[PDB]
Amino acid sequence: IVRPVADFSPSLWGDQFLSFSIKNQVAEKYAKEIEALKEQTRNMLLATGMKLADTLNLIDTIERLGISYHFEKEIDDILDQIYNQNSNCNDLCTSALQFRLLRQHGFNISPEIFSKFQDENGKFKESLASDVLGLLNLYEASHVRTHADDILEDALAFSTIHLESAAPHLKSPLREQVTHALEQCLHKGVPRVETRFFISSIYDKEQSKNNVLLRFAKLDFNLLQMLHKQELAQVSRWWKDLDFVTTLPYARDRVVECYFWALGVYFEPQYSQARVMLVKTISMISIVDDTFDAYGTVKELEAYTDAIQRWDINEIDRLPDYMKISYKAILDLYKDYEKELSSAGRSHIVCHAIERMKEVVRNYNVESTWFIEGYTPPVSEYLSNALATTTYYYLATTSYLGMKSATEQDFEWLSKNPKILEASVIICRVIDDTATYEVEKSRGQIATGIECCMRDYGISTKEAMAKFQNMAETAWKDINEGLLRPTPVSTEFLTPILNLARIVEVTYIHNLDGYTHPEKVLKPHIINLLVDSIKI
């Protein structure tokens, strides 16, 4: 057997994350000051007689500064009151911000709030075109629309064209905030990434910044970063001890990138265990993925797929030696998950992730079969297989494993492929397919999504691309509507799904697979989130 040649770039990180010793005196110092600042901030939010605009700005700032996770109850109580009083007497800036915060928190505020800013055709009054703050808030709000928000059909284009026009002559940091928003809207961005940017490049440079809030945001970011670096050191040591980098040299060595994904799914300290479980899973399926794509023969992959279905160490002897390595490691990892959840009496939910893994592997095999047969399925059949091969059902399921309050009922809801999860998977699928179409077209993969699309509908590459683009836009509307109250599960279990979609967007920004080629893509984020602390 002459396997394909190894074409993956090595880890760009070496061992710089392998060992990290937290400075306990610095951490304790930070935690102590944060305690005082957290109470001050709490009192800011509980203050009486605040104007609506000031209240919404306070909440937005605290959210963008990445410290809202300290104030879930307070922010929710305030937004609930605003939602209930339903005042409709403000400017575009405040109205657009009111609309976004409420929607993002699941309050289904009517889009009729925007009517006063439009004419009889539903077109935004082009006389708003010189209101940059209104436009910036309208722009950000345009990305939380649902299928019921056709009143906002023109909002993204209207705000984009006029913000683009105004941007070069804006003062700082507003110019930088606007230019950044045009590249990356807030609602679809990875929360820690947007927080790091907002703290350092924007709020730190605002003339009217609240100093207590800024100080709080920097200390809190840096203190959490310590925990993240601890988790990453731990996972790095775990990965190094597995030594796949030498014994499975064909596969991407990307544990840092895997960690970044887990950090994107949730950054809060209470999700420490959940992150570490998640990154190990992402790492392991990455090995599996590489095995199907760039190494294993038809026969071997058949064996591996069957072994995974049977999920039994007895099957290892049916596998080639190199496949024994990952198979044993996979089974061990899940026994470790079970053991790890034991004291909490939550070992019984691990099986949900296992079953999702089996689905990913089944469908990897189907993808391989289609490839060798030269099969080009219709889009519906293509998606019935290709959605799971994003691994996104599996990752969402995995993200719940270490979440202490995730119950069997939460997993059961997820098992039925709810709309919000389905949308996140579709977004992952269509963006990946869009990005990789030309690469894999030359690779000879006749069963790409775009190809299936062109042949199914009798359309051009450009039309197929656009149709895939529409599927992602539909899916983002489904995600937004899937966040609306009443939620089918606690919001806590929706945000990881939302965050998986956000990671896709960020990872394939500028149309390149960021995880396989982190250099341009993930590397800056990794440096910003896990290497450099925010300078105080």
Domains of the chain in sequence order = 5-48+209-535 (1.10.600.10), 49-208 (1.50.10.130)
**Rounded to whole angstroms, how far apart are CA atoms 85 and 100?**
16
The residues that are catalytic are 252, 261, 389-391, 429, 432, 508, 513, 515
Name the 3-class secondary structure at 483. coil
Task: Count the alpha carbons within 13 Å of 394 in the hemisphere toward its beta carbon.
Answer: 23
CA distances from 99 to 95, 102, 177, 289, 533 (A): 6, 6, 20, 41, 33
Helix (H, G, I), strand (E, B) or coil at 258: helix
Q: Cα separation of 281 and 210, whole Å?
A: 41
Per the annotation, does 436 bind a ligand?
yes
Q: Considering only CA atoms, which of 91, 405, 443, 469 is closest in space to residue 274?
A: 405
Contacts of 230 (CB under 8 A, 6+ apart): 20, 22
Rounded Cα distance between 78 and 101, Å, is 11
From which experimental method does this structure derive?
X-ray
Alpha-helical segments (H) within 296-418: 298-310, 321-340, 350-373, 379-389, 392-399, 408-415
The answer to whether the annotation marks 440 as part of a ligand binding site is yes
3-state SS assignment for residue 124 = strand
Burial class (CB in 10 A: 0-12, 13-18, 19+), 65: buried
34, containing H or E segment = helix 24-46
Q: How far apart are alpha carbons 418 and 396 in whole angstroms?
A: 11
Query: Exposed, middle or buried: residue 71 (CB in 10 Å: 0-12, 13-18, 19+)?
Result: buried
Q: How far apart are the first and last CA of the chain?
A: 57
Record the tokens describing residue 319, joined without a space.
């596998």
The annotation status of 91 as a binding-site residue, yes or no, is: no
106: left (phi over 0), alpha (psi -120 to 50) or beta: left
To the question of whether residue 28 is assigned a binding role by annotation, the answer is no
Please say whether the beta carbons of 129 and 135 come within 8 A. yes
Of the candidates 281, 293, 236, 392, the one whose C-alpha atom is nearest the C-alpha of residue 8 is: 293
- Is 502 marked as a binding-site residue? no
As given in the structure block, the two tokens for residue 308 are 């995974």
**Which residues, listed in sequence order, are joined to residue 124 by a DSSP beta bridge?**
118
429 is in an annotated binding site: yes
To the question of whether residue 220 is assigned a binding role by annotation, the answer is no
CA distances (Å), origin 153, targets 106, 145, 147, 149: 20, 9, 10, 7
Round to whole Å and give the CA distance between 224 and 222.
5
Cis peptide, bond prior to residue 518, ω within 30 of zero: no
CA separation for the pair 331, 312 (Å, rounded): 8
| Alpha-carbon 95 to chain mean position | 27
Resolution for this PDB entry, in angstroms: 1.9
- Given a contact cutoff of 8 angstroms between Cβ atoms, the answer to whether 365 and 390 are in contact is no
